Write an enzyme that holds these catalytic residues in place. Structure first.
Site, mmCIF file in Angstrom:
data_model
loop_
_atom_site.group_PDB
_atom_site.id
_atom_site.type_symbol
_atom_site.label_atom_id
_atom_site.label_comp_id
_atom_site.label_asym_id
_atom_site.label_seq_id
_atom_site.Cartn_x
_atom_site.Cartn_y
_atom_site.Cartn_z
ATOM 1 C CB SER B 152 27.144 -12.357 42.142
ATOM 2 O OG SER B 152 28.208 -11.976 41.283
ATOM 3 C CE1 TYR B 153 29.647 -18.582 36.840
ATOM 4 C CE2 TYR B 153 31.650 -19.247 37.966
ATOM 5 C CZ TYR B 153 30.742 -19.415 36.944
ATOM 6 O OH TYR B 153 30.927 -20.419 36.025
ATOM 7 C CB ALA B 154 30.309 -18.839 44.396
ATOM 8 C CE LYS B 157 27.827 -21.995 36.901
ATOM 9 N NZ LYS B 157 26.858 -22.232 35.796
#
Ligand code: NAD
Ligand code: NAD
Ligand code: CA
Ligand code: CA
Lengths: 250, 250
Positions: B152-154, B157
């Site tokens: 979810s972070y990538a 981003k």
């Protein structure tokens, strides 16, 4: 004062982007030994910069020769006592289709672009390690794209970028940073290309999102200053795109 | 000096990298409206900056809320009259395997990182067009490699980097540049990640060629200043690695 107290070596510093780097570097407080075969432009640039009170020294030298790297290093050390910045800017090439290429074409591109980059980095390494300095090498967006007629030009440019990434890893422990600039600027070399390939040149200019060909002094040189300065002291092994947004790295 | 006369909006500006950007921006002469949910650090930062002769305003807001974009834009114009620079720095996320991911993880990452970037860019666009301004968004090197636990972070981003390139193309005619920084810096968010994942964090620290995690003020913020300033006026749509050389874009 961005480069106050720093000594820089700039190849091809009498014309085009190298001239703008030299002008802005001195304007930012740096001592510059700029190298070129063009002593007409070279001596007049020295005359203009020293007149305004800057410390610049022109060295007339063909950097493609075996003894030039040591002569350039020795001249910078003798004039300014050290080397904080190495800008490997000079490069000559010829444009032709791959089936039209000749050994003289590869000899020109690698002999003026690639091997001087390697040899000047080797010659200046002890001084750069002492300074914990910065190396700014030069690539090209057309080498990223694979632009037609650029066989020998793009081969040397991507070889320059490869050794830049290797040296960034090998020299990071010494605090020496190595980065690449890919510019697009109105220079004498670009004007000759625009005359020989007018359709390709117009298409390249129309592609620039920011809708201009770069001005070497105000568009290209400040990017080189940033990489030579302590502002980029945590950046190494990178390629900076000074091309108006034409090619976006991912 | 470098951003004299410029107004900047900095989200997440009360801690970590955002605080370093806010500090350094004010030292370079800019007027900063910085936004954060951490009103304790936010009020002390505003007091420190105005006390040193700078112009800074703290706005307490959760930028994931759908009206915050207009509230932030209105506050910046009310305090400083315009918006020349937009720094979309805030981003919160949770780490877990793809097979362990829940909708709330995607909601947090997209809701705090990606969607505020879009909405603040839309809200500030008239001010940035008037200013011919600069937008600095934030990515991550872990999203570039696809580091485990970063689904979810990538995703958010890389969605940020995608819209940054779209807007760079769409807004270049207006003179608004849009670029990305990928940093690696000793912050509280990194410290919490170091405790939850010690071996991976040790591996990330050991990978840095320059052999240090970035200092937010001296390693990261000057890169943001470069992109926000006129030194990079010929650069848009790009991603700058402020990671000590860990990842090299080609
Ligand atoms: N100008 C652009 O748009 C553009 C685009 C892509 C890449 N580049 C790269 O940027 C750099 C600057 O290019 P430019 O357009 O200013 O080049 P240019 O041809 O306009 O100028 C090159 C300068 O280097 C000097 N030089 C050439 N060969 C030399 C040698 N053997 N020894 C010493 N000096 C020598 C020349 O005298 C000249 O002053 C080059 O490395 C080029 O490959 C430029
Ligand atoms: N520090 C690193 O090594 C690193 C690595 C990769 C990417 N980044 C990116 O750099 C940026 C800065 O990261 P950091 O390490 O400083 O993060 P951090 O968690 O240390 O700091 C985040 C700041 O933003 C604020 N914030 C968080 N969510 C918010 C919300 N919804 N509304 C308003 N404010 C909010 C927090 O109060 C805090 O002050 C982030 O976008 C991050 O994704 C940082
Ligand atoms: Ca040589
Ligand atoms: Ca939002």
């Amino acid at each position: 004062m961005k480069l106050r107290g720093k000594t820089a070596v700039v190849t091809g510093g009498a014309g085009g982007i190298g001239r703008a780097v030299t002008r802005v570097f001195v304007r930012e407080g740096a001592r510059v030994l700029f190298v070129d075969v063009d002593d007409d432009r070279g001596r007049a640039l020295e005359s203009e910069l020293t007149g305004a009170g800057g410390e610049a020294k022109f060295l007339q030298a063909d950097i493609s020769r075996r003894e030039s790297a040591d002569q350039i290093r020795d001249a910078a050390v003798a004039a300014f006592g050290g080397i904080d910045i190495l800008v490997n800017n000079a490069h000559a090439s010829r444009q032709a289709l791959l089936v039209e290429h000749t050994p003289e074409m590869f000899e020109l591109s690698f002999g003026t672009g690639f091997y001087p980059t390697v040899h000047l980095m080797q010659a200046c390494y002890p001084q750069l390690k002492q300074a914990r300095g910065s190396v700014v090498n030069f690539g090209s967006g057309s080498a990223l794209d694979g632009m037609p007629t650029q066989t020998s030009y793009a081969a040397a440019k991507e070889a320059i970028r490869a050794v830049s990434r290797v040296a960034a890893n090998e020299w990071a422990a010494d605090g020496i940073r190595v980065n690449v600039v890919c510019p697009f600027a109105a220079t004498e070399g670009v004007q000759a290309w625009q005359q020989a390939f007018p359709d390709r040149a117009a298409a390249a200019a129309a592609k620039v999102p920011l809708q201009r060909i770069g001005d070497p002094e105000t568009d290209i040189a400040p990017v080189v200053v940033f990489l030579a300065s302590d502002d980029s002291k945590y950046m190494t092994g990178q390629t900076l795109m000074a091309d108006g947004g034409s090619i976006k790295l991912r």
